[PDB]
Each structure stands twice: as C-alpha cells, then as structure tokens.
C-alpha cells in the first residue's frame, strides 16, 4: 500500500487547440478538441525496469494529475482536467491505488504503457495540457 | 481587435556575452554584444497554420515581450529588453496590435518568421534573452 | 577575485535510484546509489572559449551548488548534496575560489571538465540531482 520513488520521471505533453491550429517552433504533440474523442490515444510512455526481481515496478503521477482513483492531463494552470486511462499494451495486469499504477506481479518489466482519453472530452479548453509519472516500486 | 490562443508555443532564445566567450554544454545560440547591429538576424521562427481557412493567422507574445507596440527579448531577470522586428521571410502583409502579431488576410498559412535586432543594441547586457510567441487566430 | 558572467549555461543531470530501477520516458542519467563510489564519472561538460586570448576562463557553480569551496549536485528539493570533484581531463592547471573554477593561464581555452564523485556516498538518497556551471572569465 506504499509507492517508492525509485526511477526517471517521463512527462506527457499534449497542446489542445481549435479547428484553426496554429504550430508555432518545432513539432510537438497537438490535437483539435474535436480529436478528444473516447479511448482517443495520447501517447505511449516507455518503461524499463531494473532489479525489481522481487518487486513490482509502479509510475506514480504527480499530484496535480490525479483525484478519486481517476488520472488526468493538467494544464498549466492547473484548472483543466482531460481525464485519460493508463494501460500497457501488454497482457499484463496493473492496479490503481491513489494516483499509483503498479504491477500486479514482481519481476523488472519492460514495456510500453499508453495514455488514452477517457470519455469524450471535445469540450477541452485550449492549452497545453501535462501528465508526470515516476518510476518506483509498490509493497 | 481580439487574440484567441490556439497553436502550440515558440520560443526563441539568444545568450548574450562579451568578446570572451565561453560557451558551456550543447551548442546554443550565443552572440557578443557586438554582434547586436542594426537588423542582425536572431533567428526563424516556423509557423504551420491547419483549419485557418476562415481565419487570421496570429502570433502573440508574452506579456514581458512587448510594450508600447515594440516587441523585445527578455532577459532572465526580466530586466533587461533587446528590441527586436518580427518580419515573415515572404511577401506577406501582416499587422502588429499590442503584442499581437496577425496576418491581414484569411487563410492556413505555413512560413517562416525571422526574428531581427532593432536598432544597434551593442550595449545589451550578457545574459540569457527569451521570446515566446504563441499560435492563434485575430478578430 | 572577481568572476565576470560571459558565456552559455550547461546543466549536469543525474538521477539517483535503489537497486530497483524504473526507467520511465528518454534514455537520461541514473544511477544506484551504491554506484555513488570514489570518483565515480557523472558526466563530462564541454567547454568552448572564444576571444579570451587575454582572459582567464572560468566556469561558476550556482549558488545551491557549492559552499565552503566545496562543489556537489543538489536534489530538486535543495535538501540532498552529492559531493563531486571538477577536472579537466587533460594537464590543464586550474583553480577553485568560493563556487568559481578559473584557469589558472589565460587563452581560449577548449576542453572536457569532468565531474566525479567525492567520496563514496553510496547513502545518497535517491532523487534528481543538478550542478549548474556558467561560463565566463576571472581576473
Ligand atoms: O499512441 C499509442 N498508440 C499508437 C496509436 O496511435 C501506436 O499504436 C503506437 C504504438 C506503440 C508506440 N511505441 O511503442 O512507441 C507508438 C505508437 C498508445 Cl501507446 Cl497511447
Ligand atoms: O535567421 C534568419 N535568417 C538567416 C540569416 O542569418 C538565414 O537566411 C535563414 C533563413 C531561413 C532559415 N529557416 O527557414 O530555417 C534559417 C536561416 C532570419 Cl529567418 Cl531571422
Ligand atoms: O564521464 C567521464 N568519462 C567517461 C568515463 O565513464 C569517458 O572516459 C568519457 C570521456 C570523454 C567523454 N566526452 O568527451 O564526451 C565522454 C565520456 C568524465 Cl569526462 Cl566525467
């Protein structure tokens, strides 16, 4: 029932915009609200584990990024919320605990972990919305 | 007369030093305070507009970018300004409203926004200049 | 005596983890603590000089970086300290005064600092650690 921060932190970034988009610098992960459409992917989040034989790897996200069991993309501001759902896209089995997402089993696994929008959210705000997870272990 | 965000963010940066200049880590871009003349060239800014068919293009600047309609590099401190010209590399007829920079006609226009030194500003303190500019639509 | 701020910025990065390491996102650095060993390599840093033909390179520590001509990396958090020593890698003679590292000859230096670890400090607690150098020149 304990996380231990014990790994790189990965950070998702996404920029919601209108219709009319406009891509200022260099490329960068942006979508229209139009495009937050339920189970609508976000991006995938590697992850590579090492000496946790006898642990169970888990991302913990900040605690601006979740509430009640649920997950969430904030914006800068920390007002606007896009609720996503946090899966590998292995077989494998993860439990939620409190903004912690961790491993069912031990063992250092390696994979991908992807961030999907949960519900149709095209009424999204316009702004540049972020999702932080560290890497640890759960006892 | 209304800027609407809508476009991920720019941001241009310059190091400013003396003769002596020692340039620490990854290459970045750095210039003496000599090289400040008149018109001297900071750096592109590319602009990939989608959906604007209806739409003016715009570009705005932070708050601690423009000023009296002058647009200028910030320092760290937010102290010092070096004065800048914001000019599209093409043909383009574009119009500048207290920090907002927006073309004069409709359309999703994809081009290139050179960032220039205005006025000889050989005297600029050294220290780390920034300009962020963020996509959009005007009114 | 005096360190005169006239160069770009490099940042040394380091995550320190337990034997259970969870890699999330981009490939950075991390190490165990008990990888934390006497002189242990954390990261080379680059260093280019121009136009010091009649100055002393120099590079100097942020403030949170050094203390009691002391230099170590700080935790995000400001609390933890990591101990390092700073050397070029060639036979070049150097000199620490309170957070500055100067040359101890004048010219426009080029080379590689090197930070290591000083003293075993295998008991560091695990976390993100950083060391700032700015470049420059001393008189
Ligand atoms: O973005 C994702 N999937 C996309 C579909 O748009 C694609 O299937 C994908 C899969 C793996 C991947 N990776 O491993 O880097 C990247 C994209 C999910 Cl991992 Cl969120
Ligand atoms: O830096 C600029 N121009 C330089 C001249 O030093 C050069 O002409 C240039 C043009 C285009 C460019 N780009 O499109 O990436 C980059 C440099 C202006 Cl765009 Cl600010
Ligand atoms: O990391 C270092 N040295 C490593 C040993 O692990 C290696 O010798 C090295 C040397 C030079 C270098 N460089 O110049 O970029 C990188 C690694 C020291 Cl420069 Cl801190």
New interface residues.
């Given amino acids: 029932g304990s996380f231990?921060?014990?790994?790189?932190?990965?950070?998702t970034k996404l920029?919601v915009?209108?219709?009319?988009?406009?891509?200022?610098?260099?490329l960068?992960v942006?979508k229209?609200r139009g495009q937050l459409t339920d189970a609508a992917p976000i991006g995938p989040?590697?992850?590579?584990?090492?000496?946790?034989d006898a642990?169970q790897?888990?991302?913990k996200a900040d605690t601006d990024n979740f509430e009640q069991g649920k997950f969430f993309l904030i914006s800068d501001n920390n007002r606007d919320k896009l609720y996503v759902n946090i899966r590998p896209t292995d077989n494998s089995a993860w439990t939620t605990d409190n903004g912690v997402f961790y491993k069912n089993d031990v063992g250092?696994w390696g994979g991908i972990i992807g961030i999907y929008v949960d519900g149709q959210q095209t009424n999204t705000p316009?702004?540049?919305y972020t999702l932080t997870?560290?890497?640890?272990?759960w006892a």
């Avoid at 915009?17 to 260099?26: A, F, I, L, M, N």
Wanted: aromatic content about 2%; some cysteine; proline content about 5%.
């Fill in positions: 231990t921060p014990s790994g790189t932190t990965g950070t920029t915009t209108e219709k009319c988009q406009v891509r200022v610098g260099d960068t942006a229209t989040v590697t992850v590579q584990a090492l000496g946790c642990r790897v888990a991302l250092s316009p702004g540049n997870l560290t890497g640890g272990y």
